Structure formats: C-alpha cells, structure tokens
C-alpha cells in the first residue's frame, strides 16, 4: 500500500518486455491482431486473431487461446508461465470472443456466425454462442450456450460478446456484451445537459438519439450490457441478458469487467462523441449500473470530428480500446496505457492518473510506435503492485505484425531514475 501517489517526473516502472509467450509466425504476411488478456488468482488467459495481409478481426482464419500461470522465479518480478495453447475449433466463423479466468482455468466466450454482417442484417437466433474452456492438463472442450432458454430485460434482436475480459463471481459468469435493438427506447439527460454550439442541421436532442445508431444500418441501435451465465458443470444453464444503465449512455463498444480490490470495475471504450474515459465500479447489477467516473484528463485518439479531448455531442464513430486498472481505492488512482496523439493511434504511454490530474507517465518506446489497442491488468506480487499490459503494435512495417507484452511495477518512491 506504499507507492508513489503524487505528481512527479521520471518514474521508474522497471519496464520489461515479455517475448516467450506470444508465438512468432514464420510467415511475414500474417498479422496477429486484437489481443485480449484477463488475469485472476495467479492465472491468465490470452487470445488473439491471425489473418492474412489484413488485421481485421472477422477477416481471420485462426484464433489462439492460451492458458497460463503467474509464477515467482526468484527474479524479483512476476513471470508468465504458458501452460496450454490451442486454436479455436470454429475460428473461421468467429465474430468476437471474450476471455474469463475463473478459479484456475481459462474460459472463452465466442460468437460464431455464417454471416460476417450478422450484426447489421440478422438476429441472434440465427447465430451460435460457445464456451471453450481448458487448463494446463485438461484437453479443451467447447459447449454450445443455450440462447433459446435465455431471458432478456428488453426487446433485443442481436448481441455479441465484445470486450477485453470478463469476471467470475461464485457460480456465475459475467461477460461484457453489445446488444442490438431496432427502436429508440433510450433517453439522454446527460448529453442534453451539454452547453455546446447548436449545429444548424439537427437539434441536440436529435444528435444524441441518432449517435446511438449503428453507422452501418441506422435502423439499429447498439447498446452495451452484460450477460449473466450460471451453470453447475456446463449443465442446466441459466442465461440472463441485462442492458447497461441509461445514465450517460454511449454508443455500443467493447467493454471490460475486472475483479479488483473487492469491487467490480467496468470499462467502456469511448467510440462516440464523449471522448473521455468511461469507467466505474458496479453499484447495482439489474440494471447494470456502473458508478461512472468524472475523469477530465484521460481520452483517446480518433480521426474525424471527435479527436482526443473532444467534449461536445456529435454523431461520431471511432476510437481506441484502452483498459484501466485501479491501484488505490482511497486515492482514486488508476493505471492505463493510453495513446499520446490527437488523431493517430500511436505513442503508447503508461499513465498513472487521478480522475482530475495525471500523476506521472512514461513512453513505452523511444521511437514512434503504432498501437491500435491496449489492455492492462494489475495484481499483488511479493507484497508490491505489479501490472502486465498487452499492446496491439505494428512496429515492423516491413516484417510481420505481432502484439507485445510488457511487465512493470508501480514505483515505490516518486522520481527515481
Ligand atoms: C451455418 O450454416 C450451416 C448450414 O445451414 C449450419 O449447419 C451452421 O450451424 C451455421 N452456422 C451458424 C453459426 O449458425
Ligand atoms: C438494417 O436493419 C434492419 C432492422 O432489422 C433490417 O431489416 C435491414 O435488413 C438492415 N439492412 C442492412 C443493409 O443490413
Ligand atoms: C470456482 O470455485 C468456487 C469455489 O471457491 C465455486 O463456488 C465456483 O462454482 C467455481 N467456478 C467454476 C466455474 O467452476
Ligand atoms: C451546462 O450548463 C448548466 C448550467 O446552465 C450546468 O448545470 C450543466 O452541468 C452544464 N453541462 C455540463 C455537461 O456540464
Ligand atoms: C463435469 O463434466 C465432465 C464431462 O464433460 C466430467 O468429465 C467431469 O468429471 C464433471 N465434473 C464434475 C465435478 O462432475
Ligand atoms: C460523478 O459525478 C456525478 C454527478 O455529481 C456523481 O453522481 C458521481 O458519483 C460521480 N462519480 C463518482 C465516481 O463519484
Ligand atoms: C487526486 O484526487 C484526490 C481526491 O480523490 C485529491 O485529494 C488529490 O488532490 C488529487 N491529486 C492531486 C495531485 O491533487
């Protein structure tokens, strides 16, 4: 509980890159993209997609699933021990996957479909959803989720598991999900309170309603939510689909649930007009109400009319996924690898921040580095706070594309270099 908690320069994160976990592909044309990582109770689950001359998720043919353990090697730092590594049996039909580390095994929740455009012109009854689970010894097993016996809190027509990680609470799995609904049932009191220039075309009430529409169908709305899956031994499933609170709604986007410090932290990537950090601890579960933070310093780059630090409501789409991880509940401290650029996805920086001020930061690379998304997970190691982050990098514009894993420690004292 003793580490740097003040505004300072020159932090010593003791940063180290991990290279033996992520495989190295012999083919230079293959792009390894969209990594996911969830750590819990000393075990982790790593996932990434492989495609040919394209780094798009559904534009793939392989989906890697890795299980491992956190181990002390006497190195005075945590090490990743890879135990099992498998490819998803339905990879060529995977639309999205979310990892969950429960107890001492890996769990992968994937959405499989024949139609890459299923979210724009189809419904969830036309698709299938599976749980693939394994550990260091057991062979991987894939079970189909019975969405037929599912109960929903609203008239949803489609959904996909979308996010950087899930959570295990007792016998229930809670996975972040993005839902689709074809009628405007939503309110926007928070956005309507903004004091911005009125666009000559539409009103502020119209801007915020329409900003929840899909940019590829416009008759559909993308609303974030969670799915609660309880089971005994992959038997007698009870599945519930709850939407996120209508307080401070933002267009559907990949989220995250993480167990940290006795609370449950929810993160939602800001892919619409509110370019500041959407995150918060869970107050109620039905409806899924995270106590949204009022962060005024953490944002993300994007092209178009909503770049970094953009505040005003606007029909915008785009952004980057950047997980956060809490360090101290009383001091309201979090850590995150964010992108230090207004419009381009580049220059990742490890950032320890308040809701109101940035405490300290450090660039990951001295050279300019392209990075499309980051995820961060922190844990106690040797009675000290350590974190592991994965960055979706493209440093070799001439060699193959591959994500990178970094491990670092929160500085014990401020300003040591
Ligand atoms: C794709 O179509 C085939 C034939 O209709 C079907 O067997 C399969 O289950 C479909 N896949 C999904 C995810 O629905
Ligand atoms: C757009 O969504 C509506 C609502 O279900 C659907 O009927 C229509 O086919 C979709 N159009 C496209 C091009 O996906
Ligand atoms: C994980 O272990 C706990 C016991 O501490 C148990 O209650 C829970 O059902 C287990 N979860 C799974 C998915 O096996
Ligand atoms: C806009 O101004 C009003 C006061 O007229 C204020 O109450 C409100 O909080 C402001 N909007 C935002 C988003 O802060
Ligand atoms: C759970 O089911 C599997 C079969 O899929 C079986 O091998 C295993 O022993 C079962 N575990 C328990 C605790 O019943
Ligand atoms: C953010 O501000 C709102 C309005 O004052 C408040 O209700 C909410 O609790 C604040 N967030 C946190 C994390 O306290
Ligand atoms: C960070 O926020 C806390 C309130 O949670 C405040 O007391 C503190 O002054 C802030 N940090 C700095 C450097 O001012």
CB 239 within 8 A of CB 228: yes
Closest by Cα among 176, 71, 159, 33 to 388: 71
CB 392 within 8 A of CB 40: no
Please state how this structure was obtained.
X-ray
Query: How far apart (Å, rounded) are the C-alpha atoms in residues 333 and 357?
Result: 10
Of all protein residues, the one whose alpha carbon is nearest to atom 8 of ligand 2 is: 121
User: Does residue 68 have a cis peptide bond before it, meaning omega lies within 30 degrees of 0?
Assistant: no
Please, which residues have CB within 8 angstroms of residue 125's CB and are 6 or more apart in sequence? Answer: 147
The tally of CA atoms less than 13 A away on the side-chain side of residue 91 is 16
| H or E segment to which residue 156 belongs | none
Phi first, then psi: give them for residue 125, nearest 5 degrees.
Answer: -65, -25
The tally of CA atoms less than 13 A away on the side-chain side of residue 201 is 5
Ligand 4 pocket residue status of 194, Cβ below 6 Å: yes
CB 412 within 8 A of CB 6: no
Ligand 3 pocket residue status of 102, Cβ below 6 Å: yes
DSSP string, 16-55: EEE-SSS---S-TTEEEEEEEEEEETTEEEEEEEEEES--
Write the burial class of residue 370 (CB in 10 Å: 0-12 exposed, 13-18 middle, 19+ buried): middle
Distance 248 CA to ligand 4 centre (A): 14
- The tokens for 242 are 């709850």
Residues with CB under 6 A from ligand 7: 7, 332, 354, 356-357
Sequence-ordered strand ranges (E) for 113-214 = 128-134, 141-144, 150-152, 158-161, 167-169, 172-181
CB 56 within 8 A of CB 118: no
Distance 224 CA to ligand 2 centre (A): 19
Task: Give the dihedral sign, CA 299/351/169/142.
Answer: positive
Ligand 6 atom having least distance to the Cα of 294: 1
DSSP string, 314-329: -------EE--EEEET
Provide the b/e sequence for 180-203 (b: ≥16 CB within 10 Å).
bbeeeeeebebbeeeeeeeeeeee
Closest by Cα among 325, 327, 320, 296 to 309: 296
Residue owning tokens 């509980």: 1
Q: From residue 199, how far is each of 32, 204, 324 by CA, in Å? A: 41, 8, 34
DSSP string, 77-91: SEEEEEEEEEE-TTG
Phi first, then psi: give them for residue 210, nearest 5 degrees.
Answer: -70, -25
Query: How far apart (Å, rounded) are the C-alpha atoms in residues 302 and 298?
Result: 14
Distance 132 CA to ligand 5 centre (A): 14
Edge-to-edge, what's the strand order for the sheet holding 62-72? 30-40, 43-52, 62-72, 78-87
The data reach a resolution, in angstroms, of 2.8
Strand partners, 388: 377, 407
Strand partners, 38: 45
Nearest-5° Cα angle at 180, 176 to 182: 160
Please, which residues have CB within 8 angstroms of residue 396's CB and are 6 or more apart in sequence? Answer: none
CB 157 within 8 A of CB 182: yes
Ligand 2 atom having least distance to the Cα of 219: 2
Please, which residues have CB within 8 angstroms of residue 348's CB and are 6 or more apart in sequence? Answer: 337, 338, 339, 340, 363, 364, 365, 369, 371, 374, 391
C-alpha 245, offset from chain centre: 18
Q: From residue 214, how far is each of 103, 180, 218, 250, 315 by CA, in Å? A: 37, 9, 5, 12, 10
Determine the straight-line distance between the first and last CA of the chain, rounded to whole angstroms: 21
Ligand 1 pocket residue status of 112, Cβ below 6 Å: yes
Of all protein residues, the one whose alpha carbon is nearest to atom 2 of ligand 7 is: 354
Distance 331 CA to ligand 7 centre (A): 7
Ligand 6 atom having least distance to the Cα of 355: 13
Q: From residue 276, how far is each of 144, 251, 292, 299, 378 by CA, in Å? A: 37, 13, 11, 4, 22
| H or E segment to which residue 121 belongs | helix 118-121
Strand partners, 172: 169, 230
């Amino acid at each position: 509980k003793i580490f740097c908690k003040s505004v300072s320069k020159d932090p010593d994160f003791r940063l180290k890159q991990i290279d033996y976990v992520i495989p190295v592909q012999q083919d230079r044309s293959i792009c390894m993209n969209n990594p996911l990582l969830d750590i819990s109770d000393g075990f982790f689950t790593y996932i990434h997609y492989e495609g040919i001359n394209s780094c798009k998720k559904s534009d793939s043919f392989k989906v890697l699933l890795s299980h491992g353990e956190i181990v002390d090697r006497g190195d005075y730092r945590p090490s990743l021990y890879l135990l099992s590594s498998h490819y998803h049996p339905y990879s060529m039909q995977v639309i999205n996957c979310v990892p969950v580390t429960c107890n001492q095994s890996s769990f992968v929740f994937c959405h499989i479909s024949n139609n890459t455009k299923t979210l724009d012109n189809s419904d969830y009854s036309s698709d299938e959803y599976y749980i693939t689970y394994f550990n260091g010894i057991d062979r991987p097993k894939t079970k189909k989720i019975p969405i037929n016996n599912m109960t929903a809190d609203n008239r949803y027509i489609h959904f996909t598991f979308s996010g950087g990680g899930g959570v295990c609470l007792g016998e229930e799995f809670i996975i972040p999900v993005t839902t689709v609904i074809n009628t405007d049932v939503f309110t926007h009191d928070y956005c309507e309170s903004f004091n911005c220039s009125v666009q000559t075309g539409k009103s502020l009430k119209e801007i915020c309603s329409e900003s929840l529409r899909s940019p590829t169908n416009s008759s559909r709305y993308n609303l974030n939510g969670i799915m609660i899956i309880s089971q005994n031994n992959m038997t007698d499933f009870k599945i519930q689909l709850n939407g996120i609170t209508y307080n401070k709604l933002s267009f559907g986007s990949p989220g995250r649930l993480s167990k940290t410090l006795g609370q449950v932290l929810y993160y939602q990537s800001s892919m619409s007009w509110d370019t500041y950090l959407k995150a918060g601890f869970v107050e109620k579960w039905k409806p899924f109400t995270p106590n949204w933070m009022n962060n005024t310093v953490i944002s993300r780059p994007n092209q178009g009319n909503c770049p970094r630090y953009h505040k005003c409501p606007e029909i915008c789409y785009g952004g980057t996924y950047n997980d956060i991880a809490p360090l101290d509940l009383g001091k309201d401290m979090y850590v995150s690898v964010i992108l230090d650029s207004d419009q381009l996805a580049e220059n990742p920086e490890i950032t320890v921040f308040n809701s109101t001020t940035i405490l300290y930061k450090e660039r990951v690379s001295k050279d300019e580095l392209n990075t499309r998304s980051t995820t961060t997970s922190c844990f106690l190691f040797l009675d000290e706070p350590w974190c592991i982050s994965v960055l979706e990098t493209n440093r070799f514009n001439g060699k193959s594309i591959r994500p990178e894993i970094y491990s670092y420690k929160i500085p014990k004292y401020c300003g040591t270099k």
